[PDB]
Ligand SMILES: Nc1ncnc2c1ncn2[C@@H]1O[C@@H]2COP(=O)(O)O[C@H]2[C@H]1O
Ligand SMILES: Nc1ncnc2c1ncn2[C@@H]1O[C@@H]2COP(=O)(O)O[C@H]2[C@H]1O
């Protein structure tokens with residue numbers, strides 16, 4: 001792409017700070033310069049559930065950019081310290097009209113997200129929670145922010161976070177993770193988990 | 198006007214005909230002039246699941262349009278007889294470069310699908326198959342094509358059709374439905390959801 005636009009109103013969010021609130025009416029779009037964010041929605045009873053993560057180089061807040069406008073579709077919460085660049089929907093359109101290559105980057109990312117989100121539907125329907133938990137570990141293993149470990153990879157995730165990803169409570173995800181430990185797949189630490197392999 | 202050769206290149210598919218096979222590597226996208234299509238995924242044994250539906254005016258086959266490739270990520274099956282226009286990635290790409298509003302239209306449709314697919318995750322999550330079968334009954338109750346009933350709502354559905362919605366077998370749906378008639382929700386050709 002060519003998103004080297006000087007003007008971008010870059011701001012900083014410390015870990016766990018909420019950047020976007022689902023249901024908000026905002027005509028603004030974001031670009032992650034550094035850090036990562038968590039995408040969250042509410043499930044059947046209003047329980048918060050994690051749909052996925054976005055990283056440096058990803059856009060977010062974009063679903064409303066293509067127009068009667070609509071409300072934000074999810075919460076965007078900084079997972080680590082984030083530096084983001086904010087751009088109005090209107091200003092971004094004038095850049096896209098001047099160079100559509102910024103839209104192809106955006107379009108490429110929604111296709112990627114649609115694919116993963118489509119796959120999440122298949123995982124929830126075809127895998128049980130234990131298989132659902134196992135895929136999550138090997139999924140975030142390969143995804144960014146994982147540290148290569150002497151015995152495999154180290155990822156930053158909690159038993160509570162897996163519960164919101166796979167659709168399970170913390171205690172039951174903890175029992176699955178305890179079983180997976182003697183099965184030799186993982187080792188749970190304070191704020192991290194080490195996937196062996 | 199749609200686009201340049203929006204209707205220079207039609208193709209008609211009859212109901213139940215597969216238009217796109219998941220895993221295929223092709224670089225062309227489609228536009229539904231008439232009819233509707235079903236988006237489906239499969240598990241390892243061939244278990245057969247509906248992700249959503251698209252209708253006249255929708256593009257599909259677009260997820261590969263942004264590569265510099267990939268395989269189709271899902272099956273696209275004509276639900277009724279479809280009239281579709283076939284467009285090369287190059288033609289759409291050598292025409293959107295001239296007017297990006299046609300890109301906005303596609304993007305608007307990808308945004309709606311991501312939102313719809315995201316919501317589907319939230320509803321499907323935290324429930325097991327039994328809850329999903331029960332949910333499906335209440336979701337088809339509200340459907341516009343449903344039917345009001347003296348004792349509740351009447352809906353036209355098969356065990357196979359429920360199995361394609363929730364991602365389960367016809368046999369597993371039957372016992373779950375058998376329990377609900379005994380568990381005080383239902384009476385199953387047609388179905389009547391009591392409420
Ligand atoms: N299923 C998903 N996968 C990845 N990102 C998403 C998903 N759903 C929503 N988002 C992002 O979360 C944002 C919430 O607000 P917006 O709808 O403005 O834009 C949204 C996307 O950037
Ligand atoms: N979750 C979804 N919701 C709506 N449409 C989809 C979904 N997943 C895939 N598709 C469409 O199905 C098509 C299958 O082939 P493509 O990947 O080329 O492009 C895809 C999209 O047009």
Ligand SMILES: [Au+]
Pocket residue numbers: 003004005006007008085
């Ligand atoms: Au910038």
Ligand SMILES: [Au+]
Pocket residue numbers: 020024025026028
């Ligand atoms: Au806002």
Ligand SMILES: [Au+]
Pocket residue numbers: 138141142153
């Ligand atoms: Au890995």
Ligand SMILES: [Au+]
Pocket residue numbers: 129167168169172
């Ligand atoms: Au569970």
Ligand SMILES: [Au+]
Pocket residue numbers: 202204205
């Ligand atoms: Au023509």
Ligand SMILES: [Au+]
Pocket residue numbers: 217221223
């Ligand atoms: Au094809």
Ligand SMILES: [Au+]
Pocket residue numbers: 222223224225
């Ligand atoms: Au081809």
Ligand SMILES: [Au+]
Pocket residue numbers: 334335338339350390392
């Ligand atoms: Au109902």
Ligand SMILES: [Au+]
Pocket residue numbers: 326364365366369
């Ligand atoms: Au099943």
Ligand SMILES: [Cl-]
Pocket residue numbers: 172
């Ligand atoms: Cl459990």
Ligand SMILES: [Cl-]
Pocket residue numbers: 138141152153195196197
């Ligand atoms: Cl691993």
Ligand SMILES: [Cl-]
Pocket residue numbers: 323324325
């Ligand atoms: Cl469950």
Ligand SMILES: [Cl-]
Pocket residue numbers: 338339350
């Ligand atoms: Cl109803």
Ligand SMILES: [Cl-]
Pocket residue numbers: 365366
């Ligand atoms: Cl099953």
